[PDB]
Amino acid sequence: HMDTTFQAAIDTGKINGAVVCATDAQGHFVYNKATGERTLLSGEKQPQQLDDVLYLASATKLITTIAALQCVEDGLLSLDGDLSSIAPELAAKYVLTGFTDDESPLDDPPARPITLKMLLTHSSGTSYHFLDPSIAKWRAQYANPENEKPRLVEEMFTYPLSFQPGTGWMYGPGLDWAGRVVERVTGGTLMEFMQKRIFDPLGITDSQFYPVTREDLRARLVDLNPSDPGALGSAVIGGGGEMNLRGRGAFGGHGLFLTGLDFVKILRSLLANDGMLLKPAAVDNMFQQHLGPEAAASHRAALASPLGPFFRVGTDPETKVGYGLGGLLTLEDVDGWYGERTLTWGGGLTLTWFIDRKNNLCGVGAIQAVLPVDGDLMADLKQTFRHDIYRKYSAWKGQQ
Ligand SMILES: CCC(C)(C)C(=O)O[C@H]1C[C@@H](C)C=C2C=C[C@H](C)[C@H](CC[C@@H](O)C[C@@H](O)CC(=O)O)[C@H]21
Known part of the structure; x- marks a missing residue:
């Protein structure tokens, strides 16, 4: 019901198209579908194609997550090691606990060092x-940088911690920090490392961090169009895109551009656990709860908060979930849908992905929306993909 649901959204003018790529571990069941049209900077329309270059936004986090775990394999990092030396900017952050009534900030020194596992989760x-x-309030009083100067990761994310390291959960720039840590310990750019350790083994050559400079890639950017002459990814994140315009260097949190076909090669290598990217036991460790007791409780409070629908990535409020190395981790079966220990996340409001090892299926579904982005419609479109792909998978299994 992707077909009729996506077409309805095209007809209303709220999306231009979509790219969906799903596969099992061996490539027996494969579903690839590009729907709709893209618009070129000239205004001319072209059908959506499976090798269109997409803005991944926070789907970047999974790829940065792999890169960091590869440095762990190399002995350049450990999951639980003290990062204070490699990233002194993190060690110097204090923990904001709240405000007095005259609205002055209470902070405390950090109780322990920040580790890679904490950044990744x-x-x-x-x-x-x-x-x-709480961090929004601090940013505004200790404001303001209308500097507009392009900022590195460490010049962009200068706020105190929201809680003592390891004891809470809140979505943030941990993978931008982890990406910077990867650059520091390898002595090269994050793009260089990923090209060599992730893209080359998979035969991927059509990828770049913001800003996209390559002419061949720019000619295939969905997000280079009259509504987004900057190729900022505005349609994917729903207004802006501010962080991209203001950054300098690679942002492992949200910066990558990639085709759906190339993104699913990465998903499938993890699903199949074929050693192309990581040793099997390291992959297995991604699909485990890595929040401790206090952090797990904080996670569940955020999932029950008004932001919870974003944080739940379409999973039901009754489904117990944790956070793995790479995204949300389901902790129980949903019959007919995600098996237990499915890892899932997404990018912006328009893109989502999952890796379901128990049921042997992975996929990415990436709506190409029309500004202004109807957020409630995106949620529905992503949910249609997340469930219709299981319907298609069952029908295929039944036909064998
Ligand atoms: C730039 C953030 C990034 C990674 C692109 C992103 O897509 O995370 C997604 C993935 C999804 C699973 C869960 C999310 C959790 C909370 C948000 C609604 C977030 C989208 C935020 C984005 O819509 C707005 C930011 O761009 C803010 C800004 O413009 O600075 C969203």
């Missing part, structure tokens, strides 16, 4: 100011 304390009201 959003339990370090680094929080997006637009999601954490």
Whole structure:
């Protein structure tokens, strides 16, 4: 019901198209479908194609997550090691506990060092100011940078922690920090490392961080169009895109551009656990709960909060979930849908992905929306993909 649902959304003028790529571990069941049209900077229309270059936005986080785990395999990092030396900017952050009534900020020194595992699972304390009201309040009083100067990761994310390292959960720049950590410990750019360790083994050559400079890629950017002459990804994140315009260097949190076909090669290598990217036991460890007791309780409070629908990535409020290395982790079966220990996340409001090892299925579904982005419609469209792909998978299994 992707077919009729997506077409209805095209007819209303709220999306231009969609790219969907799903596969089992061996490529027996494969479903690839490009729907709709893209618009070129010239205004001319072209059918959506499976090798259109998409803005991944926070789907970047999974890829940065793999890159960090590869440095762990190399012995350049450990999951639980002290990062204070490699990233002193993180060690220097204090923990904001709240405000007095005259609205002055209470902070405390950090009780422990920040580790890679905390960065990868959003339990370090680094929080997006637009999601954490306490951090939103601090940003505004200790304001303002209308500097507009292009900022590196460490010049962009200068706020205190939202909670003692390891003891909470809040979505934030942990993978931008992890990406910077990967650059520092390898002595090269994040693009260089990923090209060599992730894209080359999979035969991927059509990928770049913001800003996209390559002419061949720019000619295939969905997001280079009259509504987005900057190729900022506005349609994917729903207004802006502010962080991209203001950054300098690679942002492992949200910066990558990639085709759906190339993104699913990465998903499938994890699903099949074929050693192309990581040793099997390291992949297995991604699909485990890595929040401790306090952090798990914080996670569940955020999932029950008004932001919870975003944080639940379409999963039901009755489904117990944790956070793995790479995204949300289901902790029980939903019969007919995600098996237990499905890893899932997404990008902006328009893109979502899952890796269901128990049921042997992975996929990405990426709506190409029309500004202004109808957020409630995106949620529905993503949900249609997440469930219709299981329907298609069952029908195929039944036909064998
Ligand atoms: C730039 C953030 C990034 C990774 C692109 C992103 O897509 O995370 C997604 C993935 C999804 C699973 C869960 C999410 C959790 C909360 C949000 C609604 C977030 C989307 C935020 C984005 O819509 C607005 C930001 O761009 C704010 C800004 O413009 O600075 C959203």
